[PDB]
Amino acid sequence: ANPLYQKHIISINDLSRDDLNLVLATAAKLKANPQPELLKHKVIASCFFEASTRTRLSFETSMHRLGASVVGFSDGETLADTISVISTYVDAIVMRHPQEGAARLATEFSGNVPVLNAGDGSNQHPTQTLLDLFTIQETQGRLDNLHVAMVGDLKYGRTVHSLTQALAKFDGNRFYFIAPDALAMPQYILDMLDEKGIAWSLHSSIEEVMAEVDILYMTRVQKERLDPSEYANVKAQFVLRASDLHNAKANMKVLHPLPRVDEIATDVDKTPHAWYFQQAGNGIFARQALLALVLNRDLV
Amino acid sequence: ANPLYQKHIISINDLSRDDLNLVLATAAKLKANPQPELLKHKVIASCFFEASTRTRLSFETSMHRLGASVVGFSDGETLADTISVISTYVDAIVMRHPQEGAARLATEFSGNVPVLNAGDGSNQHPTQTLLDLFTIQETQGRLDNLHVAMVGDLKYGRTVHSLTQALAKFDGNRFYFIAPDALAMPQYILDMLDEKGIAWSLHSSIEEVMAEVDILYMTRVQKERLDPSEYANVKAQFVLRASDLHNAKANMKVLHPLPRVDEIATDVDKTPHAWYFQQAGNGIFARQALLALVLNRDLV
Amino acid sequence: ANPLYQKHIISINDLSRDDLNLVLATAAKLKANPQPELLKHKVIASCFFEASTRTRLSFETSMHRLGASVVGFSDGETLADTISVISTYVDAIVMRHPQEGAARLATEFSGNVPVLNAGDGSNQHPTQTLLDLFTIQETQGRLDNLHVAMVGDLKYGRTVHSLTQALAKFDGNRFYFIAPDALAMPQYILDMLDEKGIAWSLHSSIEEVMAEVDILYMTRVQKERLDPSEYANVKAQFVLRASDLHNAKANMKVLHPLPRVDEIATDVDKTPHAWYFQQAGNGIFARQALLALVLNRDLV
Amino acid sequence: ANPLYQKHIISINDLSRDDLNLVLATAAKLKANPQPELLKHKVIASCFFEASTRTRLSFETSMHRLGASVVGFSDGETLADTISVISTYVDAIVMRHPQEGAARLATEFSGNVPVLNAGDGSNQHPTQTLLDLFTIQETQGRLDNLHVAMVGDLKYGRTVHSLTQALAKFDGNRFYFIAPDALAMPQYILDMLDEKGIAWSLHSSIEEVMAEVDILYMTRVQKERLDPSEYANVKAQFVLRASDLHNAKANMKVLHPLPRVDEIATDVDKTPHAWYFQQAGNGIFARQALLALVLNRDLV
Amino acid sequence: AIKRGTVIDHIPAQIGFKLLSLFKLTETDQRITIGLNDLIKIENTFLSEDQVDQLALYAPQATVNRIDNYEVVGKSRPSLPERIDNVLVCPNSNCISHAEPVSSSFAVRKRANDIALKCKYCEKEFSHNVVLAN
Amino acid sequence: AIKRGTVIDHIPAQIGFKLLSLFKLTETDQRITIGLNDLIKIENTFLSEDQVDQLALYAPQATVNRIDNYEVVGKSRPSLPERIDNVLVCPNSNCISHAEPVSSSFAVRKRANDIALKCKYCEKEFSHNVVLAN
Ligand SMILES: [Zn+2]
Ligand SMILES: [Zn+2]
């Protein structure tokens, strides 16, 4: 049985470097040669206690691309009892929940049934990091010795926190953090990079570092996080247009977990650097790889 | 063709004793040897006019475990017209509805398409009784000469009304009713038991009869049904803790149709008597058996 | 200063017999000779944390009929803090709240500002009892040696609980309770009547006692309280039509706290016995009397 | 006519020092000798486009305490047209609105009818600052040469921004700012204090400066503004308990614009330092003074 | 054992720790000696018989000696009080007392097999078996 | 004083009662002697040094003697454990641990002026000053 057979996938912090490469290798193999019957006769629960249409469609398409059946819901009884019941029905549970730690709690009541965390509040969203890693590896050919810029709401973007920690398991990466002072990268992340001797630097605009960047990871800057007028005075620092890419490396890719509002102008879409829609399409293979490794003994 | 082929399943009162044993035998056979392709190329409508996520996930998992396709909805046009249209689409209709008699009405407009009642208001919920019967038969080895205690809201619990009437089709059963005076077992049920010479008795607490009980069937006591303060003064009579089971028979099982709030404390969950989650898992096989018998000519 | 000057009016159980007669005498005097400037320069808060348009219009009309100004609202911060703030604004607080005891709690934070309970959950509603008493006294000439029938939901009708306890402070009254077994008069009320040697009896229909009745107090039988079908089989016992009044005493009055659905048919409205709308009009004078006694030193 | 007769009251930044003292002197005079008929025959519109029960009850009580009539609403057509219509009805408009600048816009369509800003989005709320100033002057005897500490969400508390700017119009005041780094006093306020040579300093906890403080102004720290866990790790820096006041000056007052959640523990309420409820009661006189000066030619 | 103070003896099993928690007796600063399996010794603190009566619902058969100058200057015992404040919780979930900065308060009424406890706020009456269960 | 069992000595003031409540030590049936202003004596019960380590966050400078046959057969002291379960409450109000039948659990990490406590469920880290405050 493969190292991830019947394992719960709760947090990126639980995934070793070998685990990461195993998922990424399986994702590449399933992309090259689909296996539409690998999970025939499996029934998977798609439990979206917190609705997320974009996440659910991606996960459920992944299940169907492997031949599994899907039951589920979007949106009293304790979560423990709900899992105690559903884990008697299905072969795996994919769940998104508004409370942090909900997926971890589910593992303590699901018995032999594996739990895949599709997002638990502001905690973890492992398959988003895995599809980001898979997209970086696919476009750059590696996950080491890269120049990665990350732009926007770094303070509350749990997506960049997870991607930073995952990329920190590979060598020679250099990071550029471009955020307003009120939404800066948290100190615990900077401490982690210092403990490992990983180079990082702060920059107030993307043009300072555009020439060296391999990956430009743009994030949602929700207007909630600041004043409506506080937004407008800083927002130019963190919005991307096509003219900003005049000196970009030929291999650079713009990434964005989506949805975008206006942090990426639509004239970026037609440049060869735009890769956020290809990134979204890669979620199918990263989530396929997770379901395949967890529910099938032998490797793909 | 088996006796239930292409039959509507509307009310437990319509099910003969042979019908009950047929469903239970099929459920045991499908549990021992699954048939994941028995209903391939069938399309079943999951019509939840009244939403019930816990009921729907169980029913839809049953459909998928037999290989059927599922279309459906949760939550103007008459119900007759809706069935007149949907019955041109699908091979069977599983429906839950807020109005009593809705499933019976559907049979008069569905043509050759069978209707399975997943709950019609405060009337019938046949598959809940069938999974209860199947769980009792599985844990006790029989459905006759049992001591069955039923606790809580017996007046409005249509689930215990149906289980009592079903168990009354088997011999030598003895019943214990433990309910507050305001939520007592209705007289029409007691009359039915008297006409058949079936022994029953009232008890104000579970400890009176704990030593003789084979099945302890706990029910929801919704706070709606009484005052919030009327609740608190009687609720101790009808809540179960692990210490209450000190003199229980080795074979006794605690059942509960779920969800529980606090009628069953969580320290009961780890005792060998707790069987409400296993009971819920048995709904898959009872509902599989119904779909198999109704949609497949030959017995399993 | 009158005995009720600057007193809180929270519960009928707090009102002595002298208190009751004081309120009723003041109500009669204000009805005979209005004092539209008695409370000029007073500002009263109409605090309906739980909305009740019918109660609020009556209370606010009472305030205006005495010349007071009104500020208020219908429908986080603790109730204690809200009262701590509002009691710095106004000269009196009239409040309705969904939680039992909310008016009592307000008195502990209102300082010198009196609190008038317009209804606190299922606990107290003193001005409804006071207008009922005032209407009985006005139509019968007294509150002693009366035959009072009370019909409908006696179990959950806090309005009849309060009226019974208030009438039990006067001598020689005889009560008739007509309710379904599931909604009978609670035992604590019957115990109270036994301790005082007050005569009462149960009757399954109004026609048994119609000939002796001085006051027929009809109540709301909400369909919530029973099944929709449980309702229909008992509801005839507790609905009043004009033909039911063929042998009624000339002085009998039909009372109802309102709203009625169909417990009183509209053909009763035109008989001389119908007095529920006159009863509602008497709420103006009972609530005027309370505000006058609480906010004005000298008697009317 | 007094200097504020028929003037709009939109922003504290529009109020000169003489204006501030005029309002405060009038508020003291109306408190000492009420004039319940000063505004008889005036009709004032209470326009709460954005609902605020606590603000509205205070404003409307002020109107009634002066004898004015009140029409209004809480919660398509342009705001300009609404004011164009309402200003033909009434003698003054008191308005609260979710958009910044709404009160200023109203003045350009209200003709001769004065507009009083009860809050326009995150911009201005002048009567809150005026009641704060009035409370400080009443308890300290002056508005100059005071030690004022301000605690909590200083970044988004427009209430402390306004109070700081108003107090900066008086001499010799010294400020202490106690806020988490993510919610610090904005730089434009600190610049303003530097231009005027006003002394200020930052402190991470209240105990550093407790001994010197004349006014302790506590603010709402809404959980929205940070993470739910970011809150918990900093919240102790900015919560007040009674034991924190052991070395406070005898004359110090704790202020809070309200509502409080738990930034001020209830054991502070009984100390002589607690003055937030008295502060709220002072809003009646500050708002009376504004209406009196705007609608009555001669001074009180 | 102790110099001047108060002593509580013959507390039923599994009740001495309850008395310490429910009445905050260890929130002093002078000596306290406790023995379980229960008895409790405190030095230098008043105990009105109001407060000794508050032990009746939990340790009905028990005694309290006021000790001064190493001498037994009294031996009072608890009997049912009229009111019980602070320590009980109203079982009515809709009672206002639950979310608010007020002290719980119940009227006490002896019955055949029961104590009747009537809440000051919601005015509902409950068995003491119900109130002490949650 | 005691025959066979365990003893906990040199507990800071206002911590002995906390240890009794938080670790449910009076939920036994054999003898317990307690002195405040604190020290605690129990007879005939195991105490793994896992459990003695759980006293480190509250009574860091203290000792525990395993006593058998009236003899001191050991003298262990607490040092910081890796995990602390059951007794702490997660300060994250959105943590799943609050409404659910699970035991609280925190990872322990010593810092300069601090203990860092990381919740097993929400994976948020807090100062021990924050966790013990509510
Ligand atoms: Zn209560
Ligand atoms: Zn947590």
Side-chain angles (χ1 to χ4, degrees), chain E residues 38 75 93 98 112 115:
Chain E
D38 318 307
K75 184 191 276 95
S93 70
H98 290 320
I115 312 270

Side-chain angles (χ1 to χ4, degrees), chain B residues 1-299:
Chain B
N2 79 82
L4 289 178
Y5 180 64
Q6 290 292 113
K7 298 297 182 226
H8 308 291
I9 314 298
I10 305 306
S11 174
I12 278 287
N13 295 335
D14 298 345
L15 288 187
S16 79
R17 185 186 216 264
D18 287 299
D19 293 333
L20 290 180
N21 275 310
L22 173 58
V23 172
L24 292 213
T26 305
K29 287 178 174 49
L30 288 172
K31 183 181 209 164
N33 288 286
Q35 294 196 236
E37 310 269 295
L38 187 64
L39 295 185
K40 223 65 212 171
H41 304 342
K42 303 300 182 167
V43 180
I44 307 185
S46 183
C47 306
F48 279 73
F49 301 89
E50 176 177 75
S52 177
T53 297
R54 59 187 327 111
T55 315
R56 190 177 53 79
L57 289 182
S58 177
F59 254 114
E60 290 186 7
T61 297
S62 292
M63 300 166 198
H64 288 298
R65 288 291 191 205
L66 292 169
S69 299
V70 181
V71 301
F73 64 94
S74 301
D75 311 352
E77 188 177 47
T78 61
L79 176 61
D81 283 3
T82 303
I83 303 303
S84 299
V85 167
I86 287 176
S87 64
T88 73
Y89 296 173
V90 301
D91 303 309
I93 294 164
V94 171
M95 64 144 59
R96 184 167 176 106
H97 198 276
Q99 265 83 79
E100 291 91 33
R104 179 90 58 202
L105 176 140
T107 67
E108 303 167 0
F109 297 91
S110 75
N112 284 147
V113 177
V115 177
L116 286 81
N117 184 5
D120 58 321
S122 79
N123 181 26
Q124 282 287 319
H125 189 2
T127 64
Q128 177 72 56
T129 307
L130 288 167
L131 76 88
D132 295 344
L133 285 174
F134 179 61
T135 301
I136 295 171
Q137 187 192 64
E138 204 170 35
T139 58
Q140 309 307 303
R142 62 187 195 268
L143 291 167
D144 67 283
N145 300 256
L146 296 174
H147 291 239
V148 182
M150 286 182 302
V151 181
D153 182 3
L154 308 187
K155 176 171 187 188
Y156 296 110
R158 295 288 301 148
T159 279
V160 296
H161 304 175
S162 268
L163 183 56
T164 305
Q165 294 185 286
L167 285 168
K169 296 201 208 266
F170 304 83
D171 299 305
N173 287 326
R174 180 162 174 196
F175 294 92
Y176 308 98
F177 304 138
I178 296 104
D181 303 335
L183 303 171
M185 200 67 219
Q187 185 59 50
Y188 87 90
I189 289 285
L190 309 178
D191 294 340
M192 184 268 296
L193 298 172
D194 286 340
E195 307 153 358
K196 295 171 173 236
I198 299 170
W200 60 271
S201 53
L202 306 190
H203 304 269
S204 266
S205 86
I206 311 101
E207 61 96 9
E208 304 183 35
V209 309
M210 205 70 250
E212 291 136 83
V213 159
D214 298 304
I215 297 290
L216 182 60
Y217 201 92
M218 307 286 302
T219 61
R220 295 135 45 69
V221 187
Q222 317 197 130
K223 188 182 71 72
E224 259 214 304
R225 296 292 172 187
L226 307 173
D227 212 78
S229 302
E230 186 183 1
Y231 194 102
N233 255 337
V234 304
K235 84 167 291 190
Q237 267 95 318
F238 319 112
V239 166
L240 179 71
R241 323 214 150 252
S243 67
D244 294 323
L245 312 168
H246 60 83
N247 54 346
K249 296 167 75 169
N251 63 285
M252 190 233 60
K253 296 305 188 192
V254 172
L255 271 43
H256 195 308
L258 300 180
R260 56 143 173 212
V261 176
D262 282 291
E263 47 271 71
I264 300 178
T266 52
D267 61 357
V268 176
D269 301 3
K270 67 170 147 45
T271 77
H273 302 292
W275 215 253
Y276 29 85
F277 296 133
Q278 292 86 343
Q279 172 191 0
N282 276 337
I284 295 302
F285 305 113
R287 284 162 179 137
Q288 271 194 68
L290 227 49
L291 294 166
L293 292 165
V294 160
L295 289 178
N296 186 72
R297 274 181 191 271
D298 300 327
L299 290 102

Side-chain angles (χ1 to χ4, degrees), chain A residues 8-10 39 43-50 52 55-60 62-63 69-74 83 86 90-97 103 106 110 113-119 125-127 287-288 290-291 294-295:
Chain A
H8 308 291
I9 314 298
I10 305 306
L39 295 185
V43 180
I44 307 185
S46 183
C47 306
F48 279 73
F49 301 89
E50 176 177 75
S52 177
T55 315
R56 190 177 53 79
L57 289 182
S58 177
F59 254 114
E60 290 186 7
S62 292
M63 300 166 198
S69 299
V70 181
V71 301
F73 64 94
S74 301
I83 303 303
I86 287 176
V90 301
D91 303 309
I93 294 164
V94 171
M95 64 144 59
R96 184 167 176 106
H97 198 276
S110 75
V113 177
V115 177
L116 286 81
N117 184 5
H125 189 2
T127 64
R287 284 162 179 137
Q288 271 194 68
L290 227 49
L291 294 166
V294 160
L295 289 178

